[PDB]
Amino acid sequence: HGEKSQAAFMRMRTIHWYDLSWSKEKVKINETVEIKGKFHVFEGWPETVDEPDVAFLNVGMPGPVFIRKESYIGGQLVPRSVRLEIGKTYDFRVVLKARRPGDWHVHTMMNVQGGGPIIGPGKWITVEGSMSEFRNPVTTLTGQTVDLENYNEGNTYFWHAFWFAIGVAWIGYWSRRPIFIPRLLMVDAGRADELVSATDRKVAMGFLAATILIVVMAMSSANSKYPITIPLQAGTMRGMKPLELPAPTVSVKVEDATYRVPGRAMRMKLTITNHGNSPIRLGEFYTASVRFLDSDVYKDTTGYPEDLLAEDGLSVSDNSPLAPGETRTVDVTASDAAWEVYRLSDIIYDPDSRFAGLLFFFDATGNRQVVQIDAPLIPSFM
């Protein structure tokens, strides 16, 4: 919900999310929904964005309508920030537990230590039930099961109310007598030295001693109870395992890419060389959360969001099967209302008119090749 505002070229060239899947579309309170997929870090990382040396796999949602039970980057849990390598492909997995009823647009996002949020595709997930049913039980290493929704709430309330009452008692004790104008006049006209006299000093000594003693005894009591504590666990986690993808057998060279201003279409000319030993066909072009598909080649069955999916948004001038060894040049037009709805046409406002995307080539057997393209994007007006 925070995208459609970021620079179109930044959205095009930061991180490409693909193979995304959502376990459920409608969940009850306390039920779990799992978000899986792969994200690829673009080689041409924009220079004003710091390299993802410190990155956090976040969830884009309107507050804790879900609680992030687990999140994985490469199979291992990542509660802290992680280091990602430019050009690598990682598979991720986020597990969410429903907490608040309603229709929530859940995004998979990545936060970078020096570049801000990289928001992936968002899917509407419906939560049904009541928030009062939500439970977050946690078992500690000391052998007690607590509910994280209300654990320590009473203690926090008690201590804050107690200290507030102490401060209010101090102020009220001094506020029983006249406060501002008589005291100002007494201080002004000659020495004051009458507005602070015993037992006011005794009361101040009592307040100071009681405050120090109460703090010390409360700390000692909170040491006896909860004798085992650990500091906050933090620190960037290195060694994120990337995916060992096979080298693509398709080489694509982009010879110019243009988009009409105004318009909802992007046109590019590609020289595709088919290596390997299978006839391939271009089936999908993904640029920035928007998937332009050729329905004659590939159909989406993973429940991708409708506003981001163009079922027939990809048109190839010659999409006949490309025999192995054969190289041909085709005109590829990616046209959908999403190009303007998500402001990919606002790249004309950007100070770097360059695009990046993913091309998916499918053979007869159905196995697919992921080839990555990037080129300058030239607007056309006349």
């Binding site: 919900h1 925070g2 995208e3 459609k4 505002s5 964005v49 884009g60 309107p62 507050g63 309603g102 647009h105 996002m109 970078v112 020096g114 570049g115 801000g116 949020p117 928001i119 501002f180 104008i181 008589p182 100002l184 006049l185 007494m186 006209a189 402001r343």
Partner: protein
């Protein structure tokens, strides 16, 4: 008569209006108010922004102009009892200014913090800012200017000169409103983060300090109160 029931209205108008504003933003925060490019956002928050800016400009003009036009020309021939009444009215104005300062600089500003930690920033005109930067800040600016003008035009102590602590108390908090330019510039160019303690926010901090001139202002109002109606009782 002296202190009359204008104090009750001064508290109640701010309380009721800001409770309604809080209800409005709790209703339209999500659901037409998350996406800044949806048509419903334009009708529920951009229209709010336009209406509130126009109403604030009109109200400021009307209030300040009326206070300046009804200014007391013959301040010399003013009875001490009427001076006490006017001092109490100015204290009511200061109470209203304090209430507005609370609502603007604490409630809606830390509420802007809730939003600036829970959702991805989408524009310079999110609901939170519209309710804070362009509603509550102008409201307390209007109240402070009105209090200063009333003091200068009705109280002989605050006449024959511009009070420095009063001017600082009135203008420094106002400087937070043009400081919004630093906030937006410091959030889009500087600091690709949502750190609430970033140096991009010290502009509010610097000009939030100038509200400490309320101490000099209040001792000045105490002296104005204790001009003729000082005693006796006090210091005797």
């Amino acid at each position: 008569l002296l202190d009359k029931k204008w104090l009750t209205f001064a508290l109640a108008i701010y309380t009721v209006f800001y409770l309604w504003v809080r209800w409005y933003e709790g209703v339209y925060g999500w659901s037409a108010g998350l996406d800044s490019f949806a048509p419903e956002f334009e009708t529920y928050w951009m229209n709010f922004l336009y209406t509130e800016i126009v109403l604030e400009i009109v109200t400021a003009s009307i209030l300040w102009g009326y206070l300046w036009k009804t200014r007391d020309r013959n301040l010399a021939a003013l009875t001490p009892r009427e001076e006490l009444r006017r001092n109490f009215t100015h204290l009511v104005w200061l109470v209203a200014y304090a209430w507005a300062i609370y609502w603007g600089a604490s409630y809606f500003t830390e509420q802007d913090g809730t939003w600036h930690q829970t959702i991805v920033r989408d524009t310079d005109f999110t609901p939170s800012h519209i309710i804070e930067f362009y509603l509550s800040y102008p409201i307390y600016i209007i109240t402070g200017f009105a209090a200063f003008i009333y003091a200068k035009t009705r109280l002989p102590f605050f006449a024959k000169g511009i009070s420095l602590p009063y001017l600082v108390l009135v203008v420094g908090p106002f400087m937070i409103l043009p400081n919004v330019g630093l906030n937006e510039w410091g959030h889009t160019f500087w600091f690709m983060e949502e750190l609430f303690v970033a140096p991009l926010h010290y502009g509010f901090v610097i000009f939030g300090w100038l509200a400490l001139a309320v101490m000099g202002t209040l001792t000045q109002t105490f002296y104005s109160f204790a001009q003729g109606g000082l005693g006796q009782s006090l210091c005797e």
